[PDB]
Amino acid sequence: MNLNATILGQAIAFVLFVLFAMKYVWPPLMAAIEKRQKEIADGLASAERAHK
Amino acid sequence: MNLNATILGQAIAFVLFVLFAMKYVWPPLMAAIEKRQKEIADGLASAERAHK
Amino acid sequence: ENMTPQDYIGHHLNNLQLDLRTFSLVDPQNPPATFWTINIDSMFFSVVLGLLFLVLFRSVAKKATSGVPGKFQTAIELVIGFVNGSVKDMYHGKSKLIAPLALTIFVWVFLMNLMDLLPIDLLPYIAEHVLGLPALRVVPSADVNVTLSMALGVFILILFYSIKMKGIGGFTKELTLQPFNHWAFIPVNLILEGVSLLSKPVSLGLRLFGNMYAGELIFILIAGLLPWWSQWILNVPWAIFHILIITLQAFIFMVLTIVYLSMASE
Amino acid sequence: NLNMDLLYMAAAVMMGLAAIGAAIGIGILGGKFLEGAARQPDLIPLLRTQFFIVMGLVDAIPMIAVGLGLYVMFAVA
Amino acid sequence: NLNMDLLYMAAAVMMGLAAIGAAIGIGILGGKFLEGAARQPDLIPLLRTQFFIVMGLVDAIPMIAVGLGLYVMFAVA
Amino acid sequence: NLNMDLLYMAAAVMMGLAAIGAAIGIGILGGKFLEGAARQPDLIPLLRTQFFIVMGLVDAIPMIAVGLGLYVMFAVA
Amino acid sequence: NLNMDLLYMAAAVMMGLAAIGAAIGIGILGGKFLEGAARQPDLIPLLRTQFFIVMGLVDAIPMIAVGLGLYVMFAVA
Amino acid sequence: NLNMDLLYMAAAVMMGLAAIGAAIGIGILGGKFLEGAARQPDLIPLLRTQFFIVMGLVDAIPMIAVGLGLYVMFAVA
Amino acid sequence: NLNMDLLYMAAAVMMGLAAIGAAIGIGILGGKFLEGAARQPDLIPLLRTQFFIVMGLVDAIPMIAVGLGLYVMFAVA
Amino acid sequence: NLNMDLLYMAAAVMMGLAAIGAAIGIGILGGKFLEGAARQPDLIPLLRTQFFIVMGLVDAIPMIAVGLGLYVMFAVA
Amino acid sequence: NLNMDLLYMAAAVMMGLAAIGAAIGIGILGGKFLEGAARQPDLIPLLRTQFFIVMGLVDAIPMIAVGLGLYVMFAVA
Amino acid sequence: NLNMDLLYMAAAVMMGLAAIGAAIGIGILGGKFLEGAARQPDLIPLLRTQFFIVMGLVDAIPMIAVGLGLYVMFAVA
Amino acid sequence: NLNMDLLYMAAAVMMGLAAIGAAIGIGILGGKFLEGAARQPDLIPLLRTQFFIVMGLVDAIPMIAVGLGLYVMFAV
Amino acid sequence: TYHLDVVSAEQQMFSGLVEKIQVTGSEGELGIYPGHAPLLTAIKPGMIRIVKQHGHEEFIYLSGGIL
């Protein structure tokens, strides 16, 4: 339809949501999974030595 | 036209679509979340048991 | 109410522009000429859905537990795993930026597109009869401005990475030697690689825009051109089919962004 | 006025070309789907899943053309 | 006159292209169906069910083009 | 006068297209029929049944595309 | 001026399209027939029986077109 | 008058389309024939007989269109 | 004035051809994807990855065309 | 004067359709010949003989078309 | 005036043709890339390299066509 | 002035269809040549010549139309 | 006047049909090339030589057409 | 070069490294260079050309088999 300065404003609206995510959402959520995965892996290590 | 009749026509379709979703779309998502919760319960029960 | 259907369909295609110079609403009947006329509703539901997304994710990012997670945690970690798999498939660099960018794109576009499943007349009815606003359409993705905004973000990102990883020398090489490999062809190669580069973000934005614009436009027509006892039989199957489009057009924006960046760096 | 008949002509061409494209694309895709089903009859529903996924892509443009043709044919006229 | 004349040209092109699309698509689809059948005939009822599933998806848009050709001929006169 | 001398063109185009659609559609389908038969020639009567099952679907739209051509030639024109 | 020329044109499109369709459809069907022949050099008679059977269906509507193009150019014009 | 040229156009279309169709149908058929021949170099006379058999069925309608084009150019025009 | 006569036809040409191209291309590519899946499941995710990689390029020019069609049909006329 | 103008377009379309037909048909045939040649080099001369034998049938209808095209371009220029 | 409406129509035809060409060509190419991938995935990166190489060759002309379409549509207006 | 314009179109249509016929006709042909090459790298010197020997025939008519297209485009003006 | 618009039309037809021809021809050729290269991954360079050689013949008439189209659209 | 084994049900007929071979496959003559993609086919009775590393050609007669 019509180009509008809205195209510029949406660039402002966009970037911030990237940074707030990058800092305050993604790493904290990756840790939540990976720590549980580590616990299950060391569980397997214990299972190994348990019979060894 | 009467804008009244158009909204009355919209509501019917909207409710029908909502019911279709309720009985064909939401169930499998609850099933997937159930399955992931189930899997994590199994994994972590298996881990504490291995330590012991 | 003097609604000739062809004018009812006319109203629905009208955005609510804010004339910055007068800082005032641009009325539908006369459209002022200028580049300085923000589409208020489309940006408004853009930022509202983005805020809802980041709020609901902080509601877990700060409370998540590596135990047996809650039913609400399960869903967000599901989406996290899906996105992380998508990235770890097609990309192998170290840069931290890619994964959260993909997450934002996916969820934000999914919600914007999801807007279009709301009955067409609901919020436009409320917003003018309650709040007196003259025009309202409430699907953000259905406007060139938002989509080209996101795509021209991705474009700058492509340029940034394509420099950061192989510098101006390799970049001028790629812009000249491919495809034909002989220095004599470089005057042509400069153009063809140019278009093949510029097209990518344009193609992305226009794909999303066109799909959602047509999705909206079908609902408008169905509701404005049929009697009450018939609108359902065509509105229902369209919405059922449209679920798949609202999904795929977010997924593909995510995946193509990932691919363009991973290909620019690696 | 000379303004109107062109509209129905244009809508006709739009929807004709869209019908050709969508029908032939879906025929090709479905034919490969059916040969796959013949090879792996116990997998049929998974292949149906992938088939619907890809058909959602296929029908992207043809449904755009349908709407705009219909808009011209009724919303302009 | 001409206002009532070109309509037939438009409806003709519309339904002709719709016919080409439906015919070619269903032909490809049925050909693959027969290939699958001939390789393992006991499976014919299942493959036929899948074929009749896909066939409606093929026919979806051509038939709306056809309906609009009928409309242009009769209702727009 | 044009008001009828150009309706023939419309009827021509319509069933002209419908002819190639119906021809090739059966041409492709018939091809895979002969291919399967030659591999398992004793099975022809079963496959020949299925060929007729789908052949009616291929020509559904073309046939009405022929009728409306004639109807234009004789009912309006 | 606006009468006779255009009837030759309508017949021309009718028959050109019918020719494309008939030719290519029979070509496809014949190609499959010939590979069947090369694989079962004993069954040429049976395969050719079935080939003529189906070819009878292929060329129907193209002839429905050809005869009507003739009618146009020789009965009407 | 002007009309003396348009029949050239009608013949041009009616004949060029028959050229397209005849060339392509015969191409496909001969391709499958050469394949069968490369497999069965001891059978080429039988295969080539059958090839001419069905090639006569293919190129029939093209010849009708070509004859009509010749008639319209030389006899009528 | 005449602009809103002709430009709708322009848009219809643009979008119909874009629809043909995108639908046929995606049909072919998805067909090869499906026949790859049935040949070897446990690769479905990997082949789906590569399928989207390729599909991104198919749609480029068709999508540019669709965008410009919408632009002219709504921005200009 | 339009007789001096349209009759260039007449030969144009004749020659264009003839060109496409001949080129596509001979491409298909030559491809099926070449892929046999790669597989059965000891047959090369026999296959090439059969190839010219069949290609003589391809160019016939296209050659009718090109001769009349040149006739119109020069004789009744 | 009269110029602009035809300049838009010409851009439409040019870009629609460019779209069909690019789309179908890249689809034909991606099909072979995918079927090569399905038989031996470990070669995926080498095949993807070859594919992104040849895809530029196929993309050569269509991008010129669309560039000149834009030039006509906007720079000349 | 009048007479020039329409002949640039007739020049186009001749080279337009000649370009498609040649490019695709040779694309099909070259494809099988490369298939042969990959099966027998020891025969590339042999097949390369048989490619050319056949390549000359396919693009004969396109070369003609390109010539006469240039003629009308410059000589006939 | 009524003149120049039709010349742009002729050029557009030439160049669109050139796009169709060149793109589809190289698509077919490149598809067969990719499958051949997947078959014999050692001889990729030789097959690339063959591919470029025959691709030169593919694009000939399309390149002539593109040249004439640019001519007509600019030189007249 | 790649390693090649020609073996019968009874005895090993050939072994060692090779540069290339040419075989009359069931569906047409054929030639295997190194890195060739996995393939399986029957072969017709006749000679199989070997060129052993350093270009030493030789013909082995095979009464048929599977490659």
Residue numbers in the entry:
A (entry chain X), B (entry chain Y): 1 to 52
C (entry chain a): 4 to 269
D (entry chain L), E (entry chain Q), F (entry chain I), G (entry chain P), H (entry chain O), I (entry chain J), ...: 3 to 79
M (entry chain R): 3 to 78
N (entry chain H): 3 to 69
Relevant lines from the article:
A key component in the generation of cellular metabolic energy is the F1Fo ATP synthase, a biological rotary motor that converts the proton motive force (pmf) to adenosine tri-phosphate (ATP) in both oxidative phosphorylation and photophosphorylation. The enzyme is comprised of two rotary motors, termed F1 and Fo, that are coupled together by two stalks: a central “rotor” stalk and a peripheral “stator” stalk. The Fo motor spans the membrane and converts the potential energy from the pmf into mechanical rotation of the central rotor that, in turn, drives conformational changes in the catalytic F1 motor subunits to generate ATP from ADP and inorganic phosphate (Pi). Here we have used cryo-Electron Microscopy (cryo-EM) on detergent-solubilized cysteine free E. coli ATP synthase13 to probe its structure and understand its rotational dynamics and coupling.
Focused classification of rotational State 1 highlighted five sub-classes, here termed Sub-states 1A, 1B, 1C, 1D, and 1E; with resolutions of 3.1, 3.3, 3.1, 3.2, and 3.3 Å, respectively. The defining theme of these sub-states was flexing of the central and peripheral stalks, with the majority of the flexibility seen in the peripheral stalk which bends and twists, together with minor movements within the central stalk. Independently, the movements seen between Sub-states 1B-E do not facilitate rotation of the c10 ring and instead illustrate torsional flexing of the entire complex. Sub-state 1A was in one rotational sub-state (here termed Sub-state 1’), whereas Sub-states 1B-E were rotated by a single c subunit relative to Sub-state 1’ (here termed Sub-state 1”). When all the density corresponding to protein had been assigned, tube-like non-protein density likely corresponding to lipid molecules were observed in multiple locations within the membrane bound Fo-motor. The strongest of these densities were observed between residues aI225–aQ234 and a single c subunit, where three of these tubes of density were present on the periplasmic side and one on the cytoplasmic side of the enzyme. This additional density was observed in most of the maps but was clearest in the highest resolution maps, Sub-states 1C and 3A, and the focused Fo map of Sub-state 3A. The maps presented here were generated from material imaged in the presence of 10 mM MgADP and all showed the enzyme in the “autoinhibited” state, with the C-terminal domain of the ε subunit (εCTD) in the “up” inhibited position interacting with the F1 catalytic subunits. In the cryo-EM maps of the intact F1Fo enzyme in the presence of 10 mM MgADP, all α subunits contained ATP and Mg2+, whereas the contents of the β subunits varied: β1 bound ADP, Mg2+ and Pi, β2 bound only ADP, and β3 bound ADP and Mg2+.
